[PDB]
């Protein structure tokens, strides 16, 4: 008689995507004279997006409309049932692989082992990258925090130096931002009776690139003091003003920790002596701020060895841990150490081999903080950015995030948080996901209960919808590009050379995923044969590689 099915889709309510899905659900009733009814459910309605696989398998849901490569961790073959970086990159080629070169049956055998019936692929779109900052070349991906959908997509970007996270499309921007600063933030941790920290944030270079720096610090109170548990410190340090040659500088900072004699207002005095590539100097300074509001400013003056022949930025973090706001349930190691105070030792490592060792002593005399600093920097290349003053302060952390194509990403508000779009060159507009396929998968028991006449009709329905969906998305994307311009969003194109650099990374990662199990091996072997047959892949790009 009448069959009812609940199917949840990866599309959020109020997307172009979701509207196309409900339309399909009405088409299925038409194509079956009301014998099969599909109740559509937006993302999250019944279970979370990434929980759909287990919900369908167990029958909580009858079926799902996911992005197929979300199952890459638990079914390697599914990394090969949607585009991967710099492989087959036209919708028609994936249609051919699926419907004549054996892809569909490969997919069906793999899913049936899980108690799922893979109906067929649904054509969708290519994907864009929405970024807060201008990523203008391959090297700019290093240090970026990037949301991506895992599997081979994430592996390729991790090999290009990105930190990757997996989040559902609907939930990228409350969080990815927090995550990026969590990265750039110092990481406090108790060890061996000291409070230690590690900071992993790049300098900003005038050419837009970044220059990596690893900061390791040991802080030790001069009297025994309660150590805290591990925690995090958001610190933002600005250079407020400077003279021409930086012999007089004003900086200020706000610092906050998260999971009687130190008065509300405190002044400090600092003296630094140091050497960088053999250039000796001294600095004297005076500062003030609000230790519990954690806002401080200071004025520094080069008293010897001025002008300094290197970037001020390597000294700025050396000039005040008493001025960090700590919540009540995090012991304040720095404040509790007073009046005797504390010492620290630091070893900053850069990416060109430059090294700085720093020693600091912090005490309290007469109601004023006294800081003494000794700094030794060596091994900076003479032409490098530190010695040639080509740096601009410290990165606050960089967020970029793939999700889908331009319309639906606009539905989800990406234009508000990110003012750049990163695409490939016109030859290769999508480097990571040119053909981002969805599918329909039905609980296997549900499927086999359906009369074979309705089975065939549902398969036909899905094949028709694959291209209606595709066509609908593509139309919306045409409307979206003008809205991006109105929002102030700038489209950046990478170069052919940038593509070559991704390609060297991508091909070996293909073969590693291919060799995970028998299904992944079978599917990649047939994709590779096709790619070789149409001149996608040369024999030479392949040298040293074999299933
Ligand atoms: Ca994507």
Swiss-Prot record:
GO BP: lactate transport; transmembrane transport
Protein origin, superkingdom: Bacteria
GO MF assignments: calcium ion binding; protein homodimerization activity; zinc ion binding
Binding site for substrate: 70, 127, 147, 403, 433-436
Keyword tags: Calcium, Metal-binding, Periplasm, Signal, Transport
GO cellular component terms given for this protein: periplasmic space; tripartite ATP-independent periplasmic transporter complex
Known partners and oligomeric status: Homodimer. The complex comprises the extracytoplasmic solute receptor protein TTHA0766, and the two putative transmembrane proteins TTHA0767 and TTHA0768.
Similarity comment: family membership: Belongs to the bacterial solute-binding protein 7 family.
Name of the protein in its database record: Lactate-binding periplasmic protein TTHA0766
Taxonomic source organism: Thermus thermophilus (strain ATCC 27634 / DSM 579 / HB8)
């Amino acid at each position: 008689r009448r069959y009812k099915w609940r199917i949840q889709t990866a599309w959020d309510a109020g997307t172009v995507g979701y509207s196309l899905f409900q339309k399909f659900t009405e088409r299925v009733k038409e194509l079956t004279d009301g014998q099969l009814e599909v109740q559509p459910l937006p993302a999250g309605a019944v279970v979370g997006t990434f929980d759909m696989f287990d919900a369908v398998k167990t029958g909580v849901l009858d079926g799902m409309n996911p992005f197929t490569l979300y199952w890459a961790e638990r079914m390697p073959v599914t990394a090969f049932l949607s585009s991967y970086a710099l492989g087959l990159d036209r919708p028609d080629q994936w249609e051919t692989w699926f419907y004549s070169l054996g892809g569909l049956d490969n997919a069906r055998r793999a899913f049936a082992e899980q108690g799922l019936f893979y109906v067929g692929p649904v054509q969708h779109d290519l994907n864009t990258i929405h970024s807060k900052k201008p990523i203008r070349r391959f090297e700019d991906f290093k240090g970026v925090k990037l949301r991506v959908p895992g599997g081979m997509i994430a592996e390729v970007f991790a090999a290009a130096g990105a930190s990757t996270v997996l989040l559902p499309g609907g939930e990228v921007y409350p969080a990815l931002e927090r995550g990026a600063v969590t990265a750039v933030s110092e990481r406090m941790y108790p060890e061996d009776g000291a409070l230690k920290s590690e900071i992993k944030k790049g300098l900003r270079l005038k050419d837009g690139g970044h220059y990596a720096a690893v900061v390791k610090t040991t802080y030790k109170a001069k009297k025994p003091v309660q150590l805290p548990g591990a925690y995090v410190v958001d610190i933002q340090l600005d250079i407020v003003s400077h003279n021409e040659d930086y012999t007089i500088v004003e900086q200020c900072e706000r610092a906050e920790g998260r999971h009687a004699i130190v008065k509300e207002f405190m002044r400090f005095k600092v003296h630094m002596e140091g050497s960088v590539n053999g250039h000796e100097f001294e600095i004297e300074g005076e500062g003030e701020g609000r230790p519990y509001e954690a806002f401080q400013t200071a004025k520094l003056k080069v008293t010897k060895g001025g002008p300094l022949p290197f970037a001020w930025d390597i000294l700025s973090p050396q000039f005040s841990k008493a001025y960090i706001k700590h919540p009540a349930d995090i012991p304040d190691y720095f404040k509790l150490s007073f009046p005797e105070g504390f010492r620290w030792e630091r070893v900053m490592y850069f990416e060109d081999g430059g090294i700085i060792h720093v020693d600091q002593d912090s005490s309290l005399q007469d109601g004023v903080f006294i800081y003494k600093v000794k700094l030794r920097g060596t091994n900076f290349p003479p032409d490098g950015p530190v010695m040639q003053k080509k740096t601009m302060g410290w990165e606050r952390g960089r967020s970029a995030a793939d999700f889908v194509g331009p319309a639906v990403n606009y539905n989800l508000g990406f234009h508000q948080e990110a003012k750049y779009i990163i695409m490939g060159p016109p030859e290769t507009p999508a480097i990571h996901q040119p053909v981002d396929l969805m599918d329909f998968t039905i609980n296997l028991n549900r499927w086999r209960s359906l009369p074979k006449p309705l089975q065939e009709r549902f398969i036909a329905a899905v094949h028709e919808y694959s291209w209606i969906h595709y066509a609908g998305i593509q139309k919306a994307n045409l409307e979206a590009w003008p809205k991006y311009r109105q929002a102030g969003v700038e489209v950046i194109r990478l170069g052919n050379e940038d593509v070559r650099k991704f390609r060297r990374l991508a091909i070996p990662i293909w073969f590693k995923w291919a060799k995970m199990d028998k299904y992944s091996r079978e599917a990649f072997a047939s994709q590779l044969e096709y790619m070789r047959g149409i001149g996608h892949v040369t024999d030479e790009e392949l040298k040293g590689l074999s299933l």
